[PDB]
Structure formats: structure tokens, C-alpha cells
Amino acid sequence: FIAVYQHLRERIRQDIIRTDDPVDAIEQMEIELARLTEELTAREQKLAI
Amino acid sequence: SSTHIEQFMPVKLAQALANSLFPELDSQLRAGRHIGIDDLDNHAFLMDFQEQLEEFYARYNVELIRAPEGFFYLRPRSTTLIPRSVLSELDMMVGKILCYLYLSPERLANQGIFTSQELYEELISLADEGKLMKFVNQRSSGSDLDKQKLQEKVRTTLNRLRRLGMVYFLPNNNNKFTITEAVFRFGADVRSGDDPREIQLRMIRDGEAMPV
Amino acid sequence: FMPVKLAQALANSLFPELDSQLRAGRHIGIDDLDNHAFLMDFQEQLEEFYARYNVELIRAPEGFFYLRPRSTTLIPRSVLSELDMMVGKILCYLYLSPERLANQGIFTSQELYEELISLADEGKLMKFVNQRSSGSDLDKQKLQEKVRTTLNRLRRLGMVYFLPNNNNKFTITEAVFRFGADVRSGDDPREIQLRMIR
Amino acid sequence: RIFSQRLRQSVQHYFDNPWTLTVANAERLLDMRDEELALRNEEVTGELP
Amino acid sequence: IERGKFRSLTLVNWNGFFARTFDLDELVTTLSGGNGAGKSTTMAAFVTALIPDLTLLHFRNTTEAGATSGSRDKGLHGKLRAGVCYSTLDVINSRHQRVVVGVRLQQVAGRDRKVDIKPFMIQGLPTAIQPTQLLTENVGERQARVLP
């Protein structure tokens, strides 16, 4: 279990996501996902016109 | 049936190797270049056939690796078919400083464009100036000729990092440049809040880094 | 899609190694039984494979294979030193007829050292080591060191095979002909080789 | 306030445990140095048709 | 509008030709002669003078047509003799201007059978000058010499 956690801890991407707690990181990631989805929606709307 | 691609190779792998992007990419990769998100063509290509490329390169005793930041690179094994080399300590100083510069929200307003002078100023602000000067010349004591020599060595190493794909110069001005996420590999010794010795051991075991 | 025989060829276990070697500039002679046979079998497709890199796969008339980059080569290029071609042309000269009776195909470093010193002009020797040099022992020692170094480079190219022991004795392969002169109807190889060396 | 301490201390104390990254450094393709181009000059002559 | 036309083709010091000039026709020009006479060689000289890009030029036999071979030898070198060589075209422009394009060819000494090319162009040449004479010097009793 410890090993698993250790493993995961390294795999964090950048500073705003530097919650050293993986599980805590999950939600942040997902937040990013939602953010990105909104940006994509706006961009594809621009592309249509 | 006989005389059928599947007998010798997976279709997706052959499809990848037949692409017009492959030779460029292959050449570059072998040379040590890192691939980030900005060079769309290449990046996208990599993404599309990741596992085939990994499997392919495996033949060479080399790992095609994907960092969490989304950048690809080559890591040779001890039995590698392709030579392996290490960066100089000055390259590391400039690398860790470029990393802190990327993170710095205070300079995010520049839209990524930095000047050699700003990099140099940040570096001297943090590291021991007079002790670092020992690497430029064994007799340095703060003389301007030696300070200009240091600046020229920085200018040279920064150009080497550009070939590695870690930084891109502006199209018309060479005194200014832009960063990429590939620089985060210089933080591999501290991304986890643990004992530095154990981290270092783990890294050398994985083939990521050597001592001097 | 991809041609079936090309996929077969590059699926072979020998390909990665040979690829690595070729990209380095090594020459494949008749000595390397398996590699040479592999190239003979799949030349028609390997030529096309490497043309995608703007690099040419050539089979020399003597029989050995090698790569030649174009100006638009996709592979980073590198270039030999003057002393390197000097030594190469010397080795081409040593691929002589009396060689068979003189050494039975096995030479020593001293043969080449003394031949180089005897046959070349002093001025280009100084240009090789350093212009400030003048007929001094240390200069000759440095020239010996450089000779060993360039000989190892050539061994990397596959030109010369060291006999497997620490001592510096070797045999010359046919691929050394790449340094050789142009041959015209009836011309004597010794004379033309010497004419270029002069 | 997570990475400031984490990374600054690494740069400040690097020389107590200097370490270096590994990179792929494939060999360069050796080629013949181009000698000065020597053309064939022969002052050819002949009877004109 | 009057379309431009190719007036003539000139060869100097090619394999079998010392100095020969073919006058082209307005519609069709035919070359005849037994095997090995030199017809395909004339074709090759023309195309070389038109596109001197040495990376492209590749003169395969008529047999083996369409096979991408990567042959060791492109087949041009052997069609040239030692010394200097030329291949030139005379053209009448739609503006009724006489222009002479061409190339200077020369074998490269060395084991590799390489070739050197240097293009050139001449404008305003008087209509009375023939390229065959312009490219040669009369030395001796009707024993002309070629000039670099």
C-alpha cells in the first residue's frame, strides 16, 4: 500500500496540482477537465462562424 | 493467409512506420530531443501510436517514456543498442533555473518570452555567485572579464538545451526565447517530499540520473 | 500499406543491430557472413527504406555495403580528419601483392607508423600534429598517439580488424578500397596509389 | 507554498550531492572529408564536321 | 500570339560526338540508325541541358523501364569524354528574341564516377553566329580546339 502511494506521489504534473496527497489530486485533475471542456466548447463555437 | 502483413508485423505498427512523419521524428528522438505539446504534428503522432512505438524501440533495449507533463523522450538501458550520455553541472544549474522560471507566476505576464539577461540575473540571485564562478575559471574572484566569460558559457549551454528541445528562440530575435514543459525533468530529485538520498538511489536505479 | 518483403526484412531479428551500425557509417564486407547475406537478400527494399532518410545505400563493386548521405540527409553527418584520409590511403597501398608473402594478411602498428613517416612529406606531417612542431621526439610521440587514435576510428568504420589481444596487430579488409584511386585501362595500382599519395 | 522551499533548497545545496540526467546520444554518421574538386583537363582537339 | 520554338541542339566532346549540331523541326524530328548509333545519347544530352539537377537525372535502359532501382551509377558519366564538354539549346522567344541556354559538363577525377555542371545563358547574340563555332577555337590546319 505504501509502495502504491509512493509510486503515485511522483506522478503529479505541475505546481497548482502539488497537493502531495494523490486522492486529493484527483479532484483537481477533474476540475481541469471541466475547465478544458468549457474552453473547447467556446473554441468550437468560434470555429463554426 | 501467406504473404500477409500480419504474419510479420501488426498492421498499426506498419501503418505508423509508413507515415511521412516517422523519419524526422526517429532521427530526432535518437539524438535525444524531448517532444512537448507545442509541436502538434509530432506530439499527435506520438499519441496516436504510442504503444507501437514503445514496442518497436524495445527491440533496441531502450524505453520510449512519457512524463506526466505530457512530454516524450528516450531512456536507454544498460544493455542499450544506442549510446547514452550525461549533461554537465552547468547545464543542470541552467536547467533548474529554467524550471523555476516556468513556474514563476510573477513573470507569467511576459507570455513565456524571457531574455538571457533575466535568466542570468535570476541565477546569480539564488546560487553562490563567487563559488559558482570556480567552474568558469579556477582563479575567478568577481572580475568583469570573468563575468562576461560566465555569461558566454551560459549563452552556449542554453543553445545546447535548445537542440534538446527544452527552449525555443524567437523567429527574428536571438536574445529572447520561450520555455516548454520538458524542463520539469530537472525537478526529478524533489517532486516527492521525501528523503533526498532515497530519491537519488531510486533515480540511479531507474537509469534516470548518474552522479559525477 | 507497406510492401510485404520490406515488412519481413525489418521484422528480422538482425535488423536493429545492422541499422545501428549502418547509421554510424560502418561498412559491411564479405567477412560478416550473416549481415552480408541479409543485405544481399533484401537490398531492393532496404534501398527504398533508407531513401526516405535522404541517405543512399550503395554496394561497392568490390562487394561491401555502405551508406552515403545526401546534402539533405536526415541523419546528422560528421567528417574525417586529414590525417584520417592519409592513413586510409596508406592502408590502401599496403593492400599489395607482396603483402601476402610479407605478412600473410596480418600487420602491426609499427609497419603503418614507419610507412607513414617514410612516405609522407614533412610539411603535411607538421600540419597534422601542429605547425609549431619541428622534428622533435615529443612531436613523434604525439604523432604515434594520433595514429593509434585514428586507427581505432577506422576500426569503428570496419576498415581494419584488430586481432583479439591487447597488442596492436591487425588485418586489412577489402573495404579499404574506398580510399583508393581511379583505375584506368592498363594502369598499375601501385603507381596510381603512389601518385595520389604524393 | 509547496514548491518554493522544495526547489530553492535543491539549487542552493546542489553541490552537496551533484547529480546529472541521462540522454540518448546516438552516433553521428561519419563521412569522407571532401577533398578539393579536381576536374579532368585535357585540351581536346579534333577535325570539325 | 506566336509561340516560342526550339531551334537547335549542340553537343561538344560527348561519347562519339566531337562537335555536332542538330537543327530541330517545327513539328517533328526523327533520329534513325542501327543499335548503338547514339540516339538515346542525344535525348539524354537534351534533357540534361534542360534540367541540370544532378539529384534527379537517372538514365536507365529502355528495358527495365519503370523499375525504381537506385542503381549504383546514374549512367551519365560514361556518355562524356575526358576534358571539357558542353550541351546548349538555341530558342526563339515569343518576342522574337534569340537566347542560348546550356551547361558546361566535366568529369571529376577520382574513384567515384561523378560529374560537374555549371549552367550559363547568352542573350543578344547576333543571328549570324553558330554555337559550334562560338564554342571552339580554330588551331592548326582545320583542327579546331575546344575552349573553357
Ligand SMILES: Nc1ncnc2c1ncn2[C@@H]1O[C@H](COP(=O)(O)OP(=O)(O)OP(=O)(O)O)[C@@H](O)[C@H]1O
Ligand atoms: N554510360 C555509358 N558508358 C559507356 N558506353 C555507353 C554509355 N551509354 C551509352 N554507351 C554506348 O554508347 C553507344 C550509343 O548508345 P545509345 O543508347 O545512345 O545508342 P542508340 O542508337 O540510341 O541505340 P539503341 O536504339 O539500341 O538504344 C552504344 O555503344 C552504347 O553502348
Ligand SMILES: [Mg+2]
Ligand atoms: Mg539507345
